[PDB]
Amino acid sequence: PIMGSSVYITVELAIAVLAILGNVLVCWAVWLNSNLQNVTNYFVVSLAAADILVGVLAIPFAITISTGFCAACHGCLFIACFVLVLAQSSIFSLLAIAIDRYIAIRIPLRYNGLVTGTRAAGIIAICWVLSFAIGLTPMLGWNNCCGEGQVACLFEDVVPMNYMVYFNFFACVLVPLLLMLGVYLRIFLAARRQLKQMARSTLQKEVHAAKSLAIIAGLFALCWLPLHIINCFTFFCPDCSHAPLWLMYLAIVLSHTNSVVNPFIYAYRIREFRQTFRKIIRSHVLR
């Protein structure tokens, strides 16, 4: 298994480093350009902040877990379960954006009163706490417990499948993801109707931007859904051949992929970022 193992170990670290560089460049761009310091974007950081730590921590974790290394069960679950707290603080941010964009476009006139710096910061702080609670509840006691005090760590053996499908997927991922869908659908279809008869120019522009942040949400789902849908079959259908390891490894990575694309979309769609990305590459690296 010296060959097959290896393609994985690289494609992973390749992605791990993209995620550090792509999302540090986001977080830098915001620190720099005032025009970027707005509520909507503090959530796009909290998202970058997370997709960073996927590269620094989650992927290394995903690689040592890959092998089936030995550890005590509780000090083991943390490696298994730290990707989950990050996945969570992704969805909280992705949703916080979608609602910020609902308010801004459906109820423009009250956005000022309603959305502010201070509140955004608090929301972000709260979510990170929940994200930790939700991420590593298996550490809390909902867990499944070489060397006599140790345990061979394989995700599907220390993290329970019923926690993975009910409390992680149905509850904490599929729901926010759906009602994200509910929220964007109402913004775009409302606007389609509203544009046809009637600031006309301004609506188009703040919509266009939403379609951009919506496409982010789109891809998160595309990236995670395959893996979650497998966790469903693996559990709900035990009278089914368990998905094979090549398809397993695919969707493990496919997921890690999501931490890379976010910065490329900001660049390919959103001028204010593209311009701040350009200017950082021009002034700080090329000089």
Epitope: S34, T40, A104, N112, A209, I270, E272
Partner: antibody
Framework: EVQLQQSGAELVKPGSSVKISCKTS????????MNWVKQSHGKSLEWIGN????????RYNQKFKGKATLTVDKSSSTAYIQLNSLTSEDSAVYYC?????????????????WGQGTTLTVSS | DIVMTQSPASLSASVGDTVTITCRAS??????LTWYQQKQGGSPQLLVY???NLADAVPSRFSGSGSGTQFSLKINRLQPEDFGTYYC?????????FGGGTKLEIKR
Amino acid sequence: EVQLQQSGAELVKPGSSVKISCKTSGDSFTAYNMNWVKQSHGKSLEWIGNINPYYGSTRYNQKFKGKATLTVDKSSSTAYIQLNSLTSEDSAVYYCAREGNYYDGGSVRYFDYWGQGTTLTVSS
Amino acid sequence: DIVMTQSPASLSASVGDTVTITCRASEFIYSSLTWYQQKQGGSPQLLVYAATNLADAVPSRFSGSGSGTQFSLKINRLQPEDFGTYYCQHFYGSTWAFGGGTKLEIKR
């Protein structure tokens, strides 16, 4: 379309003060910042400051800190500016202008609607 | 505080010819710059916002361009109505300024 209707021309002694009106109408006054702009010598255009009419928080240009004072009466949808220790350097046209704002990734910002302006003439 | 530099201060031109006006920022303001038109005894009219965006009811013959420090407004096909003074203004950060302005005049 916000409709901005300012007060009429003033003529005041040096050392005196003066409070110009801007009555907004036919839109949310509290939804967007109300700015002031000084046109002096017929061409020169300075930014005086703005007020967030909801919170009544003010950002002033350094130049006009300790001259201009941005107040707001929310019930009537009226923004004020008071100018103190008036000297002949103060004699100019002052405009209220509404600051549009939306998100395309950044905070977009433009003075879209302007008052008819107001002539302050200071002489002893 | 960022200084804007507008040029030319004055410029004369016949109806139906093309013209351009320049605005330099003393610091990088990205695309945060607005153009306005003032006719004799009128208020500023918003002309272009966000460096490149035509305000509604501004004719299509008007258009702005640029990013960072150098921004120009081009008026394609001058009409009688287009004569007047033109100003640029930045909206970067917490404290803003205008240009000196540009009196467009009739050439004879």
